[PDB]
Scaffold this active site. Structure first.
Site, mmCIF file in Angstrom:
data_model
loop_
_atom_site.group_PDB
_atom_site.id
_atom_site.type_symbol
_atom_site.label_atom_id
_atom_site.label_comp_id
_atom_site.label_asym_id
_atom_site.label_seq_id
_atom_site.Cartn_x
_atom_site.Cartn_y
_atom_site.Cartn_z
ATOM 1 N N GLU A 187 -20.288 61.830 20.190
ATOM 2 C CA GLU A 187 -18.511 62.775 21.101
ATOM 3 C C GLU A 187 -18.362 61.123 20.212
ATOM 4 O O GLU A 187 -18.487 60.362 20.692
ATOM 5 C CB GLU A 187 -18.766 62.903 22.377
ATOM 6 N N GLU B 36 -13.499 58.509 13.528
ATOM 7 C CA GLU B 36 -13.909 57.606 14.147
ATOM 8 C C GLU B 36 -15.189 57.451 13.450
ATOM 9 O O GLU B 36 -16.809 56.761 14.214
ATOM 10 C CB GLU B 36 -13.978 57.304 15.464
#
Ligand SMILES: O=C(NC[C@H](O)CN1CCc2ccccc2C1)c1ccnc(NC2CCC2)c1
Ligand SMILES: Nc1ncnc2c1ncn2[C@@H]1O[C@H](C[C@@H](N)CC[C@H](N)C(=O)O)[C@@H](O)[C@H]1O
EC number: 2.1.1.320
Lengths: 625, 313
Positions: A423, A432
């Protein structure tokens, strides 16, 4: 409970009046600070030398009361944009006088009308006052949904009300406000007091105020219908607007005399309280996101920085993200190892970015739900979280879980993986650096190995919001580019905004990536059909992800996952607001760029007009590798 | 402080708003408190016109809840008041004429009521407000018969025609002078010169020709308008500032009294040439009333609290 005030243009005794409106249940009062009819002269004698006092005394109320209970009103005779020079001059001075008096009293707000097209001089005098001295009063602009000229009874024989409909003409009132706040250079001190009418305009011209700084909504008593028992109520379409305004959180202002003499005044207010008590209660999402509205958050550095214990703590409470992950692992185990192999085949599972271990637990819950056997690796680069992981594996997990304290791009794996679970997703999916991370780690995934998630896609929609445009503008810092605030994306629970077109896909990534030459750089052109007049202030980012097969996560509003508070939308702002007309197409261009050290976005608008290319070279914002 | 009769207040508020001579020669006074602690108003009757503004030598007096923006006589004992409170109220005079008692107080306007005029019959009246509306009243029945939202800005002045009970003028800051006739399905008719000029502020019908009227604008110009012509006949720059009122003399060939925020009074002939000018006031001149007993005597009131009696050539 609603916050509401009484509008009055007649106050014989300030002590008695405030008491009556308070007993009626109002939180505050809108009243004149000078007598509405007390026209003052500033230039020519003898009226110039009129014996004082000019108004009543501050001593009549406590400091607390002035600060919290009183909203000032400009005198109705003050016309700074009059065609008569003498009236222009006196009104200039009278406005300053009344404004200074409000500041002197420490009034929390002060009401000024927009009741015509030309308010240029009014704007100038107010701008001048804002930049004179030190005060924090809010200036509410009283502006109606429908102009008075477009509401008049069709009763002038030789001047009929032009029956031919006008899409732009019915929007003139927004252009009154737009021009005013543009001249005043979007001062954060100038908000809207929207006047609601008996005839709500066409639905679009109501939309127009979506995303403007509305602080108050003015409801004249004359718009209230009366029911079977002689009580004030509102039309179904009026209730609709009220509920929209309640969701936005504004203050309500009752104006005009009591037109239902059979009962008290608190009855109008009783109804608003009734309407507020009758809204649907907050969902699971709105309970956790309750205080985040339009709060801009600086972009996180996922690789250069380490997440705080309390950060992990909050997100670990997500009611859906982890069970969705459990189900994705649950479905993948069954598909990979057939029933006759349930005791012989032990699947090697690697959690890449294990945090404080909730996905590791989710993997364990999945295996004992699929009745299959797994071997777990728990890789985490944050040495502080690694602490939590190793205490867990000693006290609970045992040798089934092997904790690895390193970066996944670096870790030399002892064996290849059946399934990699991760994740690493930001609000714009790939912000990210999940692509780059899983790319450096896929070499230890088996040739037939599954990556969870399988793929993710970002989305963009153009938005209007003077509220958020002002918030970004206010993010200017010393010792950097005076325009850098505009060249970086913000994580924000978008609230006071208007979405101008439906979200469209932007960038997509699949894992694993058996592409011969792996390139994560991107260039995308999007065309957004806009069907209203408006001003473009930026682009909302969302994302969707395929975990496994049909098990998904989404923050795209159309396909949002119920209760999932873990991600807020991203906001990509633009340096300068862009005017957009009904029927026009907004064209935006987004690039994803990179070198060995960092990954960044660059964006530009090419239609209806061009913007400057934003963030060229990553000069204002990058994400470090 | 010679007397000040029962029910009459001890003091009168500084800002004199209206002065109106009754047919028998008595003088009606309307006043507001536009500053200080209390923002109210009062009504006064002076059977001795020379005694005003002195509260001591008055026939009757009363305090209203709020300020008096405008008033008028209703017959001989009725007083109709345009109030700050949004209310239109009727005050009935005493049988001995020593008390002023409230008859009705109806809160029908949403903002300050700025103007009132009694229609020819004396049974009905028209009020104008900042709430942009114009209302038609049944004085005996104490109700609004008709409400009209014809204007686009606050109503400045409403003036009933001398002889026709369904005709009246009205002007607003939307730059419209409207000629009304409530017999038509569309009652209002936009009347002006040719090109729209400065905002109309004051209206006066001709006392003998129910077809001509005068209007003062905010730039100090007074103009003469014929209704059956729709053309502006004659105009003169009378005042240096806004013209707030116009009152014709009870003469055969009437003179026109003209008051302004430049603190001066003017008296003009039928061709609007200057006959007399008074700078006796030191503040805004608010009303003018011609004496019924002496037709060369004219009384003006101001915010300077001066009641002034003029002798006109
Ligand atoms: O969208 C947000 N941050 C971007 C991050 O990429 C969000 N993810 C969520 C999942 C997660 C799990 C473990 C560690 C970090 C993150 C960051 C965000 C920021 C601040 N508050 C948010 N939600 C509030 C927490 C209670 C509502 C979300
Ligand atoms: N290149 C990398 N190598 C190893 N770990 C990483 C890398 N990049 C990010 N991480 C970690 O991956 C985690 C990502 C979190 N959003 C997920 C935490 C945890 N799995 C949870 O869902 O609660 C963070 O703890 C990061 O510190």
């Amino acid at each position: 409970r609603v916050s509401s005030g009484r509008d009055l243009n007649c106050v014989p005794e300030i002590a008695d009046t405030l008491g009556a409106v308070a007993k009626q249940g109002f939180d505050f009062l809108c009243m004149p600070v000078f007598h509405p009819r007390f026209k003052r002269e500033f230039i020519q004698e003898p009226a110039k030398n009129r014996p004082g006092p000019q108004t009543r005394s501050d001593l009549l109320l406590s400091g607390r009361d002035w600060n919290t209970l009183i909203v000032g009103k400009l005198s109705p005779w003050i016309r700074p944009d009059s065609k008569v020079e003498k009236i222009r001059r006196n009104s200039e001075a009278a406005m300053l006088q009344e404004l200074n008096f409000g500041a002197y009293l420490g009034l929390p707000a002060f009401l000024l009308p927009l009741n015509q097209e030309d308010n240029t001089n009014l704007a100038r005098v107010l701008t001048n006052h804002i930049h004179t001295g030190h005060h924090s009063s809010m200036f509410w602009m009283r502006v109606p949904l429908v102009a008075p000229e477009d509401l008049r009874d069709d009763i002038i024989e030789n001047a009929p009300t032009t029956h031919t409909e006008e899409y732009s003409g019915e929007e003139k009132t927004w252009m009154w406000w737009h021009n005013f706040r543009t001249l005043c250079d979007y001062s954060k001190r100038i908000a809207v007091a929207l006047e609601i009418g008996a005839d709500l305009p066409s639905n679009h011209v109501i939309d127009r105020w979506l995303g403007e700084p509305i602080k108050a909504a003015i409801l004249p008593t004359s718009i209230f219908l009366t029911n079977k028992k002689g009580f004030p109520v509102l039309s179904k379409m009026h209730q609709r607007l009220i509920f929209r305004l309640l969701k936005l959180e504004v203050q309500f202002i009752i104006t005009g005399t009591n037109h239902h003499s059979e009962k008290e005044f608190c009855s109008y207010l009783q109804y608003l309280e009734y309407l507020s008590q009758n809204r649907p209660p907050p969902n699971a999402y709105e309970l956790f996101a309750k205080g985040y509205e339009d709060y801009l958050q600086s972009p996180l550095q996922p690789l250069m920085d380490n997440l705080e214990s309390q950060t992990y703590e909050v997100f670990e409470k997500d009611p859906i993200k982890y069970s969705q992950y459990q189900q994705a692992i649950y479905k993948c185990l069954l598909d990979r190892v057939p029933e006759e192999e349930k005791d012989t085949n032990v699947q090697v599972l690697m959690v890449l970015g294990a945090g404080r271990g909730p996905l590791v637990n989710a993997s364990l819950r999945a295996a004992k739900q699929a009745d299959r056997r797994i071997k777990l690796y728990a890789v985490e680069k944050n040495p502080n979280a690694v602490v939590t992981l190793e205490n867990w594996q000693f006290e609970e997990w045992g040798s089934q879980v092997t904790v690895v304290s390193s970066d996944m791009r670096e870790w030399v794996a002892p064996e290849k993986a059946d399934i990699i679970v991760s994740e690493l997703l930001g609000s714009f999916a790939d912000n990210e650096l999940s692509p780059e991370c899983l790319d450096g780690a896929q070499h230890f995934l088996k040739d037939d190995g599954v990556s969870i998630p399988g793929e993710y896609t970002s989305f963009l929609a153009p938005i209007s919001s003077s509220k958020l445009y002002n918030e970004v503008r206010a993010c200017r810092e010393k010792d950097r580019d005076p325009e850098a605030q505009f060249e970086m994306p913000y994580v924000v629970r978008l609230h006071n905004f208007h979405q101008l077109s439906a979200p469209q896909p932007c960038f997509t990534f699949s894992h694993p990536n058996r592409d011969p030459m792996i390139d994560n750089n991107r260039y995308c052109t999007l065309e957004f059909p806009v069907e209203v007049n408006t001003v473009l202030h930026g682009f909302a980012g969302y994302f969707e992800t395929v975990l496994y097969q049909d098990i998904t996560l989404s923050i795209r509003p159309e396909t949002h996952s119920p209760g999932m508070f873990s991600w807020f939308p991203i906001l990509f702002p633009i340096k300068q607001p862009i005017t957009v007309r009904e029927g026009q197409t907004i064209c935006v261009r987004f690039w994803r760029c990179s070198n060995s050290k960092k990954v960044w976005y660059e964006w530009a608008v090419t239609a209806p007009v061009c913007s400057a290319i934003h963030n060229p070279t990553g000069r204002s914002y990058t994400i470090g590798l | 402080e010679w007397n000040l009769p029962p029910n009459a207040p001890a003091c009168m508020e500084r800002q004199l708003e209206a002065a109106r001579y009754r047919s028998d020669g008595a003088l009606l006074l309307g006043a507001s408190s536009l500053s200080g602690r209390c923002w109210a108003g009062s009504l006064w009757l002076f059977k001795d016109p020379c005694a005003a503004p002195n509260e001591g030598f008055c026939s009757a007096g009363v305090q209203t809840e709020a300020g008096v923006a405008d008033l008028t006589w209703v017959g001989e004992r009725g007083i109709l008041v345009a109030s700050d409170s949004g209310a239109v109220e009727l005050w009935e005079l005493d049988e001995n004429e020593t008390l002023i008692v409230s008859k009705f107080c109806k809160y029908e306007h949403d903002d300050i009521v700025s103007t009132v005029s009694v229609l020819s019959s004396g049974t009905q009246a028209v009020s104008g407000s900042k709430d942009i509306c114009i209302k038609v009243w049944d004085l005996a029945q104490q109700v609004v018969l008709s409400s009209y939202r014809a204007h686009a800005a606050q109503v400045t002045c409403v003036a009933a025609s001398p002889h026709k009970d369904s005709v009246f003028l009205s002007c607003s800051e939307d730059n419209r002078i409207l000629l009304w006739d409530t017999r038509c399905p569309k009652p209002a008719s936009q009347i002006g010169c040719s090109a729209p000029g400065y905002l109309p502020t004051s209206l006066a019908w001709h006392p003998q020709q129910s077809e001509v009227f005068v209007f003062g604008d905010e730039n100090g110009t007074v103009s003469l308008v014929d209704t059956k012509s729709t053309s502006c006949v004659l105009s003169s720059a009378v005042h240096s500032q806004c013209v707030t009122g116009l009152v014709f003399s009870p003469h055969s060939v009437p003179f026109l009294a003209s008051l302004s925020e430049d603190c001066s009074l003017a008296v003009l002939d039928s061709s609007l040439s200057e006959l007399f000018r008074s700078q006796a006031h030191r503040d805004f001149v608010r009303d003018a009333t011609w004496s019924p007993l002496n037709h060369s005597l004219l009384t003006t009131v101001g915010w300077d609290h001066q009641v002034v009696h003029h002798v006109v050539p």
